[PDB]
Amino acid sequence: SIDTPNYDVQKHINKLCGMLLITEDANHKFTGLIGMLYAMSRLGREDTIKILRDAGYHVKANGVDVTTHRQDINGKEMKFEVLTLASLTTEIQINIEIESRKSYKKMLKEMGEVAPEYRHDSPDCGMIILCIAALVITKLAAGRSGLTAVIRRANNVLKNEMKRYKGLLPKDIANSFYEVFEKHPHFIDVFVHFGIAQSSTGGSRVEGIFAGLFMNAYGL
Ligand SMILES: O=C(O)c1cc(C(=O)O)n(Cc2ccccc2Cl)n1
Questions:
Q1: 99 C-beta closer than 6 A to ligand 1
Q2: Exposure string (b/e) for 145-163, b if CB count within 10 Å is 16 or more?
Q3: How far is the CA of 101 from the centre of ligand 1 (A)?
Q4: What is the spatial distance between Cα 3 and Cα 196, in angstroms, rounded to a whole number?
Q5: What is d(CA 180, CA 31) in angstroms, rounded to the nearest whole number?
Q6: Which end of the chain has fewer surrounding CB within 10 Å, N or C?
């Protein structure tokens, strides 16, 4: 059973990535999977199922829809927009939203209203996460843990993005991607097809950073 998000949930998944990026001392246990969900929503359900079947994997496709979940937090009833995911519980998704909301209030208290590029809903949050995946892919292709080189290459290449996001923690995010590619090798095929299609055309500064990072996995 594999979740195959379609184009319709791409904005939702990007916001989930953004929620983690604004979280102070964020738990990046699910970032590898969330990043892979974003790549699949960019490829679309049809292309994702095609990649897996062609790569030889058997796939029981799970439809991904947005649902409103009612949950009691601090005595008060709250409405959360969550995705129907077999790989990520409603509880985990809601806790990511709760923790990010705590960080966001701290930000308001520190600088007043937050600029677009510093928010959880900035359009490049998913791509920022996928830039770490591009660094991990290089070290899995070049030979069994080039983790120190990933962190150091990340602090240079993603210096502007680290300044924008407190939860952009290269060590934790790289560990999460290493873990998902080891545990679910079918995600390597999905990421490689995503990277080939993306490096054809953007776009934004982050889309440009990603294409250069991805292209490096082959040449100079
Ligand atoms: O004015 C806004 O756009 C606004 C308000 C809030 C908030 O009250 O947390 N936030 C942060 C936010 C909103 C929804 C889901 C997660 C978060 Cl962190 N943005």
A1: no
A2: ebeeebbebbeebbeebbe
A3: 6
A4: 22
A5: 9
A6: C
CA 25 to ligand 1 center in whole angstroms: 18
Pull the structure tokens for residue 126.
């998913």
Structure tokens at 205: 């500064």
Q: Write the CB contacts of 185 (distance below 8 Å, at least 6 apart in sequence).
A: none
Residue pair 211/199 in contact by the 8 Å Cβ criterion: yes
Resolution of the solved structure (Å): 2.7
CB of 93 closer than 8 Å to CB of 176: no
Residue 176 CB neighbours (<10 A)? 25
CA distance 40 to 61: 12
Q: Rounded to the nearest whole angstrom, what is the distance from the C-alpha of residue 83 to the centroid of ligand 1?
A: 18
Q: How far is the CA of 113 from the centre of ligand 1 (A)?
A: 11
Q: Please state how this structure was obtained.
A: X-ray
How many Cβ atoms from other residues are within 10 Å of residue 143's Cβ?
A: 7
Token duo for residue 140: 């899995």
Strands 76-83 and 66-73: antiparallel
